[PDB]
């Protein structure tokens, strides 16, 4: 029973830490690819203009 209780303690602590870190990752997410896509359409439009010229 002591083993089970301590294991549950560890499980709860690990769940807390993993959820916290993954939520931090989610918060940091998407800025890079948003700006990346913006730059990509900008460059593609540049290429289209140059080709038309």
């Amino acid at each position: 029973k002591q083993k089970s209780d301590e294991w549950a303690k560890k499980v709860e602590t690990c769940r807390e830490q993993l959820q916290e870190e993954i939520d931090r990752l989610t918060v940091e997410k998407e800025k890079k690819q948003e700006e990346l896509r913006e730059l990509r359409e900008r460059d593609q439009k540049e290429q289209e203009e140059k080709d038309r010229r």
């Binding site: 560890k10 499980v11 769940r15 990752l25 940091e28 890079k32 690819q33 730059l39």
Partner: protein
């Protein structure tokens, strides 16, 4: 069993978020410099 299962699931989805964010920073910086150079070229051509 529950601890190991959900910890592994957390590991995979943490790694998924890591993949989603990661190298995109390097690509953003690379195209930042690329637009720097492209704007330099366009400025030079328009000045000419």
């Amino acid at each position: 069993e529950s601890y190991d299962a959900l910890m592994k699931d957390q590991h995979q989805k943490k790694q998924e978020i890591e993949e989603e964010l990661a190298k995109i920073i390097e690509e953003v910086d690379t195209l930042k410099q690329l637009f720097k150079e492209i704007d330099e070229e366009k400025q030079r051509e328009r000045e000419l």
